[PDB]
């Protein structure tokens, strides 16, 4: 089984949408078109020495196509997302990732360009760069599995999916000023591999806005 998903002028090859977590059980919904497509970010290399990676949302897509154009040329907007993490590796690599979606992921070691990496995303550290096992804020990472999450354990699966509804104190809000979601991908178990295998496996993120809607155009 190999599903070939499509959104407009974009196509993605998912092994299967078997493990697809919906954050807090709520599917994205409008308030009771073209921007909502697959935007695949620049891959990051997971090595033995990695501590983690993190992107914000909608900050990650501030430059991507219409979801960037609209996100600037409007004032207010809301959007759910579909973060698809593909971590294609061999059968002779081993490790685990924890993909955690975090509402209002306020990081701490704080000045807009600092907490808004954009497309490339930031990285954690193990002692700016926030701490890996803390997620910046003093917070034991074990308890981090409260958040909407999924485990990419290479021995069994090599891709996760996260459907994220719009989560904010407001019905609609300015996307330029204020992020809603924060994706953090941290290695629960370290990478390891056979003798001379590819020593750094790639992690790819495919973000797809869902129920993207904005007001008011200038």
């Amino acid at each position: 089984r190999v599903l070939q998903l499509t959104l407009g002028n974009s196509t993605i090859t998912t092994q299967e949408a078997a493990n697809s977590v919906v954050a807090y059980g709520r599917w994205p919904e409008y308030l009771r078109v073209a921007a909502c497509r697959f935007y695949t970010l620049d891959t990051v290399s997971w090595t033995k020495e990695s501590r983690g990676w993190w992107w914000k949302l909608p900050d990650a897509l501030r430059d991507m196509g219409l979801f960037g154009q609209n996100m600037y040329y409007h004032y207010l907007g809301r959007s759910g997302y579909t973060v698809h993490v593909q971590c294609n590796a061999s059968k002779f690599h081993q490790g685990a990732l924890g993909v955690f979606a975090v509402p209002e992921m306020c990081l701490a070691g704080t000045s807009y360009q600092n907490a808004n990496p954009g497309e490339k995303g930031g990285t954690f550290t193990g002692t700016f760069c926030p701490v890996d096992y803390l997620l910046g804020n003093g917070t034991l990472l074990g308890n981090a599995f409260v958040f909407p999450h999924q485990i990419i354990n290479l021995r069994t699966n090599n891709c996760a999916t996260l459907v994220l509804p719009y989560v904010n104190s407001l019905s609609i809000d300015s996307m330029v000023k204020h992020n809603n979601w924060g994706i953090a991908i941290l290695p629960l178990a370290p990478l390891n591999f056979a003798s001379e295998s590819s020593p750094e496996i790639p992690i790819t993120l495919t973000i797809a806005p869902m129920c993207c809607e904005f007001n008011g155009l200038r």
Binding site: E104, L140, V167, L170
Partner: protein, 191 residues
């Protein structure tokens, strides 16, 4: 089996002191600007309520404030004073705060005020949800904290001979709580 005491209402709605506001009598000797006390309502000071609220991201709650006033003469001197009255003024969000003892805010119709007579039942009000947003944000990943209001306190009696200090304990009890989006709880470390 029963999960009532682990309900949000039972876990949160519990009378917790959040400040101790000290005010002196308007004695005409050398008294400083300690004649009145002002405290912006904020949970970020008491660790118990804060650590319980930072389990969760968003929130909504009415806020029952009880006021326990306790006075005493300062000097060993032969102290005498008729029963004091205390103006406990709640200042809603976005409103001006008192600067002086005889500022106009103590005569403003907007600002609701309690007139507690010393030696009686503790004063009380019930602030409703006063958020512009549809939920109190405990964590906000954006650029330009939430305003609950201010509590100001003074003695109403003016030309008093003997000094009288007084502490107003504020027992805040959140009522009708709702909380969304749980989070890992912080350690007690940075509090």
């Amino acid at each position: 089996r029963s999960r009532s005491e682990s309900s949000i209402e039972s876990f949160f709605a519990r009378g917790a002191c959040v400040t101790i506001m000290t005010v002196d009598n308007p004695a005409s000797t050398t008294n400083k600007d300690k004649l009145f006390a002002v405290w912006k309502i904020t949970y970020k000071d008491t660790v118990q309520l804060r650590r319980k609220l930072e389990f969760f991201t968003y929130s909504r709650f009415d806020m029952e404030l009880t006021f326990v006033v306790t006075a005493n003469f300062t000097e060993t001197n032969n102290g005498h004073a008729l029963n004091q009255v205390y103006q406990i003024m709640y200042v809603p969000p976005g409103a001006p705060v008192p600067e002086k003892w005889d500022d106009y805010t103590w005569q403003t119709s907007s600002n609701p005020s309690i007139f507690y007579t010393y030696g009686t039942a503790p004063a009380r009000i019930s602030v409703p949800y006063v958020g512009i947003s549809n939920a109190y944000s405990h964590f906000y990943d954006g650029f330009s904290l939430n305003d609950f209001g201010i509590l100001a306190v003074r003695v109403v009696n003016d030309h008093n001979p003997t000094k009288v200090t007084s502490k107003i304990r504020v027992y805040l009890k959140p009522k009708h709580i709702r909380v969304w989006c749980p989070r890992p709880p912080r350690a007690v470390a940075y509090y």
